[PDB]
Amino acid sequence: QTVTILQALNKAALPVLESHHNHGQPPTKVHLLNSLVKLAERELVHLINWAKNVPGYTDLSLSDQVHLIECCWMELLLLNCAFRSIEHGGKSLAFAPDLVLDRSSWSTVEMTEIFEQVAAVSEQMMQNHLHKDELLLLQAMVLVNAEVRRLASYNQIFNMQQSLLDAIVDTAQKYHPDNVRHVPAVLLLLTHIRQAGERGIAFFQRLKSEGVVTFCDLLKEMLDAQD
């Protein structure tokens, strides 16, 4: 049920990670990005562990479990960050409590178009009074909506999508009763997260290629899963 899904997603809630960024050295492009890149990798390991808790997911084929993650990992990172950043009303993005970056920083690391979209999404979440339970459902949704093409596990993914859709609708009724515009408006945010994700991955691929910023192999395999 909606209730069972939510309990599951909630006892698997991602913890918040510190960046342990060294603020003792000034924020060069390289300095910030190495913290951002590896904050990403730690949150990445967590997502993977978290995904296996999304009800139905461990019943997909291994290849498709990996595939879903390969499609949407960056979206999940950005989606989370947006929610972490809800209090800043679009003024900054909180990648970690340890690492809040404003538009100024975004320019330094040359990820302005990306973070400007995310930050705006953050503001929309704030404006739509999004509850944690709704966000939990949203990430699960981002995951199961990762690939639109037909996979071997098509059936099971369909079943998960249907269950998630019901849970989102019921959860919206709980925290925002009789508001028919809410779920659609919030789902519309996902289109921006998707756009941000795509640009995100493209940027990280070119970071990888510039070889200055160091990637560990987990993040690096994710990048090489595209092209």
Q: Which of 77, 209, 140 is nearest to 223 (CA)?
A: 209
Smallest separation, CB 172 to a copy of itself (Å): 10
* Distance of alpha carbon 60 from alpha carbon 146, whole angstroms: 14
* Distance of alpha carbon 211 from alpha carbon 208, whole angstroms: 5
User: Position 79: which residue type?
Assistant: L
70 binds a copy of itself (CB under 8 A): no
Between 62 and 180, name the residue whose CB sits nearer to a copy of itself: 180
Binding mask 134-173 for a copy of itself (x = CB under 8 A): -------x---x--xxx----------xx--xx-xx----
Site for a copy of itself in 187-226 (CB under 8 A): 187-195, 198-199
Maximum distance among all alpha carbons in the chain? 52
11 binds a copy of itself (CB under 8 A): no
Of 79, 94, 99, 121, the residue at the interface with a copy of itself (CB under 8 A) is 121
* Distance of alpha carbon 91 from alpha carbon 74, whole angstroms: 21
Burial of residue 191, with CB atoms counted within 10 A of its CB: 0-12 exposed, 13-18 middle, 19 or more buried: exposed
178 binds a copy of itself (CB under 8 A): no
The count of chain residues that interact with a copy of itself, using the rule CB under 8 A, is 32
181 binds a copy of itself (CB under 8 A): yes
* Distance of alpha carbon 150 from alpha carbon 156, whole angstroms: 11
- Per-residue CA distances from 192 to 82, 120, 185, 221 (Å): 11, 9, 12, 25
> Which among 8-16, 37-45, 98-106, 116-124 is the span making contact with a copy of itself, rule CB under 8 A?
116-124
Q: Which residues bind a copy of itself (CB under 8 A)?
A: 116-117, 120-121, 124, 141, 145, 148-150, 161-162, 165-166, 168-169, 180-181, 183-185, 187-195, 198-199
